[PDB]
Design a binder for this molecule. Sequence first.
Ligand SMILES: Nc1nc2c(ncn2[C@@H]2O[C@H](COP(=O)(O)OP(=O)(O)NP(=O)(O)O)[C@@H](O)[C@H]2O)c(=O)[nH]1
Ligand SMILES: Nc1nc2c(ncn2[C@@H]2O[C@H](COP(=O)(O)OP(=O)(O)NP(=O)(O)O)[C@@H](O)[C@H]2O)c(=O)[nH]1
Lengths: 168, 169, 359
Amino acid sequence: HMREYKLVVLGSGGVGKSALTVQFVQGIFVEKYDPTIEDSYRKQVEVDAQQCMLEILDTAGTEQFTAMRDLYMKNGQGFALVYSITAQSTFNDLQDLREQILRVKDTDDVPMILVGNKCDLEDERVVGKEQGQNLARQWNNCAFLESSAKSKINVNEIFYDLVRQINR
Amino acid sequence: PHMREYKLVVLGSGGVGKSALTVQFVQGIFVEKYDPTIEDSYRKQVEVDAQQCMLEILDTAGTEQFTAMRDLYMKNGQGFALVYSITAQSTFNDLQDLREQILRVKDTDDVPMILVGNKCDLEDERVVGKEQGQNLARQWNNCAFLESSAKSKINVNEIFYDLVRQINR
Amino acid sequence: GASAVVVRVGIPDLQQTKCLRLDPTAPVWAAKQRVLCALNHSLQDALNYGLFQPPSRGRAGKFLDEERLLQDYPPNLDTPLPYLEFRYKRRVYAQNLIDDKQFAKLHTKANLKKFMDYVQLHSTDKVARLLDKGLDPNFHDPDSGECPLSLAAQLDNATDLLKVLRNGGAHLDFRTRDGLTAVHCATRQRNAGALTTLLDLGASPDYKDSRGLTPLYHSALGGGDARCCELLLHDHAQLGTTDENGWQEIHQACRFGHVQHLEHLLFYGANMGAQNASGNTALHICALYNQESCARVLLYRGANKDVRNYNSQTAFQVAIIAGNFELAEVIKTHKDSDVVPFRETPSYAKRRRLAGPSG
Ligand SMILES: Nc1nc2c(ncn2[C@@H]2O[C@H](COP(=O)(O)OP(=O)(O)NP(=O)(O)O)[C@@H](O)[C@H]2O)c(=O)[nH]1
Ligand SMILES: Nc1nc2c(ncn2[C@@H]2O[C@H](COP(=O)(O)OP(=O)(O)NP(=O)(O)O)[C@@H](O)[C@H]2O)c(=O)[nH]1
């Protein structure tokens, strides 16, 4: 008998939600950009020496569907909120997502991680690490990571951390 | 008793009635409308020599042929039906090259095979004699020969039944 | 299609494989039409069949949405030719599966009827429980012909129920026996709340019925309260859908004098000069059926009254032959000074990105 973990990846379009999830599950990074309608990935991993079944929901950054978005939020045990270090707009959007998750869940505490993706592209960087950490502190000292799907930096840690938080 | 799988292939030049033959056999429907075939797969259970057989029928393309598909289907195919139109001389002429290609890929002189003269209902339009088909069939190591009409349901079942008998032998 | 690619489509239910040319740039509905035409009508409840993306390398199985473009779902490169499946639109369950017999019980005629009665009587919490157990909400009541989602769309303040059914694995595009979707059914009942929730839950407003008619087209036929018509147009609903005789939305609105519907349609881009098989424009239909109020709206918004159909009749001349002498006076009397272009640009929701590229 294996414990099931329902994880959701939310963010604005182009942040790298699909690339992060696909790197974790399939160990492939795709340069090509195909917008995501909806996708579900299932992968078995060992976290704290225990076999875990991860169900990962890859959402659409570009579409908004409030009834569906609330249904993702109601079902999800843990949430990864992804922003691009290169794109300021994506960082700005996350504040509203936070409050929406807490409203639907109807509790101040929900397993969550703040993810700064595209950390490999330092030259294009428009968002400081301190900005992410400062925001994370505002969110009841929420977990924070900088990650690159392309360079395989902190991809595994994102999903491992969510499982740890759900277990506690 | 144990149901044996039979992998059958229908090849011919465009418009001979490969699709109509196969669809008449499997669905008992004759389609007037002509849609060229890329590649179509039918599975049907039938009783041949008091045994239940699983037929996998591949319906091939006469026109807009794909090489990789053709190379695959000849290697995998257990039995082959070469279809020509009695009305169209060109389709009859083309079959000789198909037969030699099957023998080359199979790397044996003996492969379960039948020569089919389709559209036998259209006697008025006939341009190919029955004797011409039989004469060709004799040339092909006394290969099986049939005249068939998908429209009139003549000799449709016999084509596939004959292929199963040959594979059994 | 010009940019079409070859796709191997297997119908498990018929045990058939069909390699077909499908247009990636065209919508999924286009591709589905090609599969059904190739099938020689071999399927029962064919409209509730849909193309299906097989599961691969962790990635879950899902159905192609009919109103999305084929190229929005990239193909797998594992097969030499890209492989899609045509399947009946049953609930997609998770990898983890419930007892085989426990299902057969849940899906008995009697149990299904009981479940539909819960939806009919708006017992949300009991409906949720049976869905959690694993009942597949994508079925028809035999006498009624309605799926649960179509029934839910009829009920007032059904948002609670609609959300629960969609979470329970009901398909938004699941059609009733007659070929209408929940979106069609919400619009017919003029249920603004139900329609808004379906659109909110990922539904497209452009779902086609048996005859290819859209919910917007159904609203123009039905008239009455015009709120649903506006909500569909607000959702970037498609315009210029035509029946077998070539009638567009304004053509049907003009015939039954649905003046609120005509106004919404005109405002959101409706081609006033569009003509049916006869060559009649909306103003022609307005003259034929003596709809003076609808006629005024067209004339007011810049409709050309000199347009002549294939019998060489103007709207004025159609009115005369029909006997509507007062209506012909209105059309002849009307002058270009009376025309008022639309004040402002229409407003759209941001619910989904528009099919096709943006530079
Ligand atoms: N260098 C680099 N490129 C990345 C990274 N993550 C994503 N990309 C690139 O950015 C683009 C967007 O990736 P994608 O995963 O599709 O983002 P998304 O969140 O799935 N967007 P959507 O909401 O439409 O699904 C792709 O072209 C991809 O190559 C990353 O960490 N580093
Ligand atoms: N009268 C009559 N017409 C037939 C008969 N067999 C086929 N046809 C007609 O011939 C045309 C071609 O049929 P079809 O079976 O598609 O030919 P094909 O061998 O499939 N050609 P392709 O290689 O492109 O798939 C159709 O219009 C069909 O109705 C037959 O026995 N009688």
